[model samples]
Target: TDRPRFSFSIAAREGKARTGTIEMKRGVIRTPAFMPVGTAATVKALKPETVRATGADIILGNTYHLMLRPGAERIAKLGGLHSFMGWDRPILTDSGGYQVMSLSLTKQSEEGVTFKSHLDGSRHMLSPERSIEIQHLLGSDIVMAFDESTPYPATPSRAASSMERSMRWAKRSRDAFDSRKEQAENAALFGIQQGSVFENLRQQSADALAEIGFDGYAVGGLAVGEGQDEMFRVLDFSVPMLPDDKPHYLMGVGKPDDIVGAVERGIDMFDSVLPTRSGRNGQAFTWDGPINIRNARFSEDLKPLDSECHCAVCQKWSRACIHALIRAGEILGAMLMTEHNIAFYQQLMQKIRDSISEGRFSQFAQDFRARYFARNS
Candidate 1:
């Protein structure tokens, strides 16, 4: 099968850790890549071109939100997702399964799940086939398989049952995708391995996905409510079970420290809304941990968000001006902070890649965490 694909070449490896690049049709993804979440067809404040300038080779779009609001058919009529959003690079769209299930707070069945839309009171059904159809309409570069993210703190039996159901859905998603010409021609679908935090369940889920196969494999059902330690434990075994030839994505993960740790565990791709979401709330991420710009300490202080960052936000703005705008409830505050935060994350990914290539990932990780944790204002 001449699959729409990605090629990974490890420039160096230290223990299970390594650095590589994912060569894709849209652009070159420098692993370990941190995909900024554009959940509602927008990354919140910054424009698509500004996002690209932050060194992001790709971004993520949410299936559930887009489907509920404008609908994928509307996006397709506007000349596909890329043209609709003015983003010509890669976009990875999650199957609406997770968002529908999680946000709806509902029960499930064998055929599919029903959930109420948070946008309105309208209820919707998202089965495997429907998921594939939505992603194809969105024209996503990386499409996720339809799978449930079982709520955390589940009993072993509950987790096992959910994982088995997800495995069945994975097969259906693959079949539906194969039946479609657009999915086969342009987009690549990845299967999600779900099992909560149970290693045995993870193993079973991973094996199921391997048998069915996908363009890539994602380690899902983590970072939901599970602490970092448990998340790492699952990744320790879960990552190795996946095909090394394909990209490994850790969905909806993480803070800066979490990203560093996950990269050490061999994860190639990640998507999180932390930086942008936090930025909107006046939280700024720096080389030093997170700093709240609303604090009175910055009333007279004049400095960039992060002296080390080269983003235009940092280059042009001062701490006092940022604090003043945020205090005044100005939109520019969110825009600048989000832009700077995105640049900071991309810079971190680039540094990690360089360190792994130089075989000094451990040292880099240690130094980064220490400084990030130590210098919070």
Candidate 2:
């Protein structure tokens, strides 16, 4: 369909786990997709082609960072983020609302946020309108609605107050998005539902978004510091309340287990820095759980990081070599580890999609989690 489209059909579900796909203009992102964080227009140490090879159909860009650094206008002048970064695939850009509140040194206000730059001492402000404009200039395929992310375990009153303000901003973000005639035609906008952990507040947020409408919905504000159990509790009520026809994104979410659990609750899209950040720090995510490469026990292990992984690093390098290099402060160690971690994440997404398509997602989750947890245990 030439019209911007997003289709999500549950192929299978066991408890909270699900298998689905999100169709975008660039391509279809298989549900339970793992989008590596591409903050500041790059996926950290890895190249875009290598990231794609890891099976990622899309990567995330940070509006807050790009707008502050190269400046969104600069990127637009150079032909937007995709052209500038040489990645033609789909990309989702955050609204910068989160960064303004979380990373900025000072708070601005309810109408917008202002903060001293983490990069420089300069000041910046981000409102719904400006956030949308930056993402449009960046040429994101999916644009998130600007909203304030509330802290978890907040009072019901506090949650309601924050959600109401966010709902107002959601409308502003939607209007700002719609005003962009060119960007609106090709890009999709996803509204974020924020209510902390309160079901009534969540319902209110969902209803407010349905009024404004969006191309998709995201369960945001959890995974901030809320434990997995609490986050899952909110999802049990919040996610199902969203429109079923559109894609559901779980923002800034989580460890391997968090993704699996959210997919079970019917979330279809995800972006996280867990895998990449962990990889750079000498941690390896395997089918059997995460292992630290610097562990003394692996100092002499001649086996691959993950004996079963097919990634270039895992296929060629031994655990002992990785350990020695990392212990010796070699830069290649981080590169290799990042590559393998991205590959592992991508492989896991593919396996989830395949399992869902085959109507075996239940068994897949069980088997996958058993081995993953076993390694940790």
Candidate 3:
């Protein structure tokens, strides 16, 4: 049988946690996948090959940053983002909605968002059509639908208003995406569902998105500042509202625990800057919990960052050495730390997929959380 252009097939399931594959023109992405954020066409401190070495099947690019810096047109002329960045694997480009909301000083209306660029205060307008155009120009394998992210703590009326507008925008995004003949044939488009924390509103958003249809659905508007409990509360209902057969992406989320919990709630794709950002800040995530390498206790500790981790940094360097490097503000400290953290996240995802395939995800989550949160308790 011939596989669909953008297809998702479940290989195994344990509760809501699933092991699957998302087939794209570039390659196949294993479910419960962790995509490192390659904002500005680079995954921060690590090279594309180094990121691929960490077992990443796909990486994310920021349309807002790229379009603002080198300009999307320039990238297209230079042979698109893949050729420019030298990453041949699949690349998912965000619609730039989140960045417009959080980074730029902005104004929002029914038409779109008009904002001053965070880079140099230059002005720009980001509408659904423009966002889709940018993603296509960048040659994104997975293009996100452009929609306003509903702010956290919004009242029912406010959330509904925002969600409805987003639905309208989603339709525009879909139309614009399909208009690009070349992109529509090989690329995939994902619609984002937004409704703050309201269940009915979430249903409304999901329903609207389903009507328009998409290659995937993203559960957005969480992890803004809504602590884990609230975020999970929304996902409990929001995720199940999405199409079962399509890939479910949880955007801008999160720590290690957040990914595990979302997978348990049926999320398949995720991209976040937590691991890389934390690494540069001298924090390392381990099986037990996160540890700050800057701590006085690790000044002379000879143990590896995580004894169980098989990453190069963990396999060779000791806490004492890492601590010294960080304390001295060496650039290598950030590189090594970021490398290990990315490797750790990929390993964690692999374990989740394996556990689900073996029908042991429930027990795995329980035991993993127990040890992971034990230090805090």
Candidate 4:
């Protein structure tokens, strides 16, 4: 019953944009795919089936958060993360590196980062080897290489040093992954390319990573304080540097327009927390951009959140009622909003896939931009 470790095939292309499928032992992931962020062991408010129902073939999990809370070792003993989390499809786990940086690390070296758990103030170590070991223990289908995310506004010298160090760590991650023969055989390892906003450094990082080799590659170190335009500028040059035979993932990438633009520029995969996170705060994504469901104007409105959406939430709930609930701080309001946002994102992905296959992505993009920026109410 063993499927191949991984296989990627582009089904159609429209200029730089394309629609494809990534076949893994767990399931097949369709691109341009949007994996909802499941930080701890969950996608925050939603259930695994709920996420699957949104036409998602995969979801993302974080190694650092899982290791810090509930423990990776415990997960292994309980029969791996998929069953524990109840997601039957493919699960991609990031190396603990990014979260380490996000947490204000205590120390860093060629070795790893030392940091305290924001959850319990407990100290921890997250080296390349440690990160791989933890992800293996969690039974991740797609594993990310550990790389130091170069912060934005960095000088070329600083960016080069960070990118080079990250490349070294990628080699370490590759070695560590291979040693765990079982996990290695069943899983796919993706190396991260980090160079801030420099073209030459990005090329150098890609060459180093291509030398080391990986099942896929991710364009990391963007979407972190660099605004949308700069991020797209980087993607323009960054995307063409990688191995075209494999999937090109853009980590922590963004809003619907960002996804559309990145897809237009040739990123095959993305994962972001925007949809679900904003949902919790009463911000809802719609065909006409995002609307604050908590706005007082929505309180007396009887229409559904988005007339264009067919998500259960939109099909059933009223804006006035949801607005009232959020305004009243009701938990159900957040749940309903979160569910709708998740489904809306999936619908957008479906639309993108269809547009590319139908050979109208260029036209589709203009239409989307017109409508997305159309609503300010």
Candidate 5:
């Protein structure tokens, strides 16, 4: 009712590639946007202002972590996630379904997932309704619906069962969302599409999600150990099955090449932990490719991490310096590396948007893959 309160518009298109904007009450997110994962109400090492400075339009928070550590109800009492976390921009929250399946010891049935917390081994039940309530309490701008994330390499029959159960949970999630009229009016709810590499099952899941309706649609169950080739093959058939008007989010997707490939295949939004997590481990993603700063080859090197990168780390620090810091186990090494990686991702997205607007996405993709793969190879 009332058009679901959120709006998305495509500003430019190039074949399957497109550039767009998602207008929410908090802010306007320019697509193809890359959301930095802010699991546990923080983007790890980086402050909210620093995250914004990297040109990020949105960030993702995990319900499982927040609910476990800080507690969603506690966050609501303290003034919600944005105020609590100091991120004034739009924040998207996952429904904890994936964590329930992956991180916790879970018992799955028709009702919902019953699991033990990975934090303290506390017992908890996360139904569709409960998941929605947690997100609402945390004041999520974009809330993801609860669903089972089908593991990769699942059989056709098992995949089908998982997808069907996710669809059922999606309906219950929608209903629960609708019950909270004020929160529903202010925030947008997205439904997740599940099917482990099966086109037919993906189509079925997409159709079921469309029938239920949502502010956006997410391609889940991919990048969950499925190789890039297989994931791309699924996108070839599954992405086109969803509505073109709403935002298309690829959850927990991927390296730089993965984001570029997904955008070329019609994905509009993405969230991943690659940049921050890799940064802590002394790896930095660059235009040429990713570089491991801890490598002995960089011990005496005097060049920046990437000659092409304009991030502060590249502008001011040398590869030798970063390597020494990382080798010495300095905290600043992680901070600078993570910031640069995040900036690199945002810059890549801006370039992709520009390429789509200029109708040269194919050329851009080809050129990018050539250099990126060549370096990584």
Candidate 6:
């Protein structure tokens, strides 16, 4: 009643794509938003202030890595994640379900998953209760529920079996989050719905998560092995199954085109290592799609990375300028590239929001794809 801790309000709609804001205690997330993967408390090469300069309202943290390293307990003792990281903004931490299960050999049971850390081979166990507890210590503004990312191409029965267990874990996550009154009131918990690519299973998973409830719901279990066509097909049916009032987050999702497609299907929030990882690898996303700055042609070229891009890297640096850095293996090369790529993603999200507000999303998507895909490899 008195300045709600969280609220999602939609301001405009174009077909199924919508534009709006999610009011959070740290900051408001403008919808059709993209959050960079801030694994291990940093967004790779760029500083937090620079990341904000890229127009990012939020960033994602890797719970699995943090808990395995300096440890969540240490972070809490040091004054929470934001204080230590010095971001002073919203940070969403994954529940470690996907990492603990996929990144290591795990002994899975109804109680929890016992796994070895990829960093130091340390043994650890993660259950819904434990995951929520760690996020509480990390002071995550947006906490994901502890749930499995169902492997792709599973048999229908196996998908059903996997989803049912995740639903149970979702309930456990909800209960654990609520148990912490102080953190609960200050933060928000998001539930993951996983069911492989099966329709009925997706419905069942959605229904279960709905009953358990969350501040947001993520369309999980895709982008693992399933191609874009199938993921979009799953979204066509699965997205509408979720509660309309709450925002939908597409977890571990994907390229610019993938986000565009998901947004068309009504997904409101997205996070991926694509921009950050690829950027470090020297890939720069432009309106003409991603370009490898290491290409030989750029050695003598004098133009900006993307003449259309308004980022500092694009405005201040030239193709040959950054090309020299990359060719010489300079560390600043990755930083400049990441800076541009993230800014490009944010700019794209802003364009999507603006297009929806102007009721020209369909045209924008079509025109964007035409130029975006014009690049041949």
Taken over the whole model, the C-alpha lDDT of each candidate is: 0.85, 0.83, 0.90, 0.89, 0.89, 0.88
Judge candidate 3 at residue 202 and give its lDDT. 95
Q: Per-residue lDDT tens digits of candidate 2, residues 1-377?
A: 46244555666655556666667778877777888887443544677777788888899998988888888999999898888767788899999888776777465577787788888779887889989998998989999888876665678887888889899999999999889888777788889998888788889889999989998899988888879988889899999999876778899887888887788788888888888888889999988899999999998898899888888888899999999999998888888898898888888788877877777777877888899998941
- Candidate 2 local Cα displacement, residue 14, angstroms: 5.2
Candidate 1 error regions (>4 Å): 1-5, 39-44, 105-107
Q: After superposing candidate 2 on the true structure, give the runs of residues whose Cα lies further than 4 Å from its correct spot.
A: 1-18, 39-44, 105-107
Over 4 Å off, model 6: 1-3, 39-44
Candidate 4 regions exceeding 4 Å error are 39-44
Cα lDDT tens digits, model 3, 1-377, are 45456888899988877899998778889999999988544544588788888899999999998888888999999899898777898999999888887777567898888889777888888899999999999989999999987666788888889899999999999999999899899899999999998899999999999999999999988888889999999999998899988889999888899999999999999989999999999999999999999999998888889988988888899999999999999988988899999999999999999999999998989989999999541
| Residue 327, candidate 2: alpha-carbon lDDT | 93
Model 5 is weakest, by summed lDDT over 10 consecutive residues, at 37-46
TM-score of 6: 0.97
Mark the 10 consecutive residues where model 4 has the least summed lDDT: 37-46
Cα displacement (angstroms), candidate 2, residue 246, comes to: 1.2
Could you tell me the C-alpha RMSD of candidate 6 in Å?
Answer: 1.7
Residues 280-301, model 6: lDDT tens digits: 8998998988889999988888
**Higher-scoring candidate on lDDT, 5 or 6:** 5
Q: Tell me the TM-score of each prediction against the true structure.
A: 0.95, 0.93, 0.96, 0.96, 0.96, 0.97
- Worst 10-residue lDDT window, candidate 3: 39-48
Per-residue accuracy of model 5 over 41-83 as CA lDDT, tens digit each: 3545688788889899999998898888779889899889898
lDDT of 1 by residue, 1-377 (tens): 34235666767787677678766677777788999987433555578888899999999989898888788899888877888777888889999887776677454787887787788878777889988898899988888999866777888988999899999999999999989985776678899998877888888998999999897899988888889998988899889888887788999988999999988888888888998999899998989989999999987778898888898999999889999999999999988999898899999899988888888999999999899889755
Q: Kindly give the stretch of ten consecutive residues in candidate 6 with the minimal lDDT sum.
A: 37-46
- Clashes in model 5: which pairs? none
Which pairs, if any, clash in model 4?
A: none
Greater lDDT among 1 and 6 belongs to 6
- Tell me the lDDT of candidate 2: 0.83
